[PDB]
Amino acid sequence: LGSVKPATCEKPKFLEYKTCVGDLAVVIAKALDEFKEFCIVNAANEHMSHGGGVAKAIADFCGPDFVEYCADYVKKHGPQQKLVTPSFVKGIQCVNNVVGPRHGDSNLREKLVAAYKSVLVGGVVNYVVPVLSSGIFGVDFKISIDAMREAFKGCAIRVLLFSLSQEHIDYFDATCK
Amino acid sequence: KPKFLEYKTCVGDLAVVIAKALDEFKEFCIVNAANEHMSHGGGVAKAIADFCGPDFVEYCADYVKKHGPQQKLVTPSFVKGIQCVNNVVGPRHGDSNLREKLVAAYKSVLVGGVVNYVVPVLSSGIGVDFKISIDAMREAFKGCAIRVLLFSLSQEHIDYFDATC
């Protein structure tokens, strides 16, 4: 519960997508120049451990404050399927730690759509989003990306989709064809 | 994205280097010859900080305040066409084995998702021999499928590289 301070930038007229392939630092570098402020989506686990993958890069980036926040929170409240936290980085309004579904889970598409829908944070119009469930969680990046387009359709936000893999971003461009 | 390593050169001040890079590359990473505390008061570091501005300066300051000194730090540039700044700490003054230090420095210029780079001669300012820096760069970039624009105020440095090609 509670709201994050609303962004000082304005919502776009329609849904806008951007992409970035590369290391987290590259992605944030793009986002800080394109977005006045933004939410970064973390591909988390329910323990908010951040031991591997992009969760590890985001944890290392945001630093000790962020690791400590998640740690104190899970100890106090237990495991979370979603946790909107501070980032402790100027320009980064919050980190939205979303736990997506895993390979083989029943009702996969519905669970993917719901995860992306949960990305949204009141007062935030710009988002930096990974391919949820496509790392350790083992879901086909294509179905995750289709889930995203379905979740965000009609939505007045800006979304920077990012990945280490050019294939993932090439596939996104093919969704725009 | 190139088939294999390509080199370009530029003698000039930062404004002329960047103008050329924007034309040749469209988009690229600029390498800063930084110190570990990311203090950009002098040399190309000053040129870059002054070009990219207060957000860049504060970004670097804030990061070192949180995480300690860095030997490599990739940051926003806050400039269209410049994908990021990669601040790379070369050796000084000295410093045992330059080179291997210089080789390790140049290798660290590489960032996932960037293929075009605008690179100074590391450790050439206020100072290590430039021929060893340039030799080190050649060794580090061998086999890399990237584009490198090497730049300097000194015609002397560019000439040594051009003979090297």
From Swiss-Prot, chain B:
Cofactor: Zn(2+)
Subcellular location: Host endoplasmic reticulum membrane; Host cytoplasm
Record's bilayer topology term: Multi-pass membrane protein
Catalytic activity: Thiol-dependent hydrolysis of ester, thioester, amide, peptide and isopeptide bonds formed by the C-terminal Gly of ubiquitin (a 76-residue protein attached to proteins as an intracellular targeting signal)
Domain annotation Macro: ranges: 1-165
Domain of life according to the entry: Viruses
Reported function: Responsible for the cleavages located at the N-terminus of the replicase polyprotein. In addition, PL-PRO possesses a deubiquitinating/deISGylating activity and processes both 'Lys-48'- and 'Lys-63'-linked polyubiquitin chains from cellular substrates.
Domain notes: The hydrophobic region HD1 probably mediates the membrane association of the replication complex.
Protein name (Swiss-Prot/TrEMBL): Papain-like protease
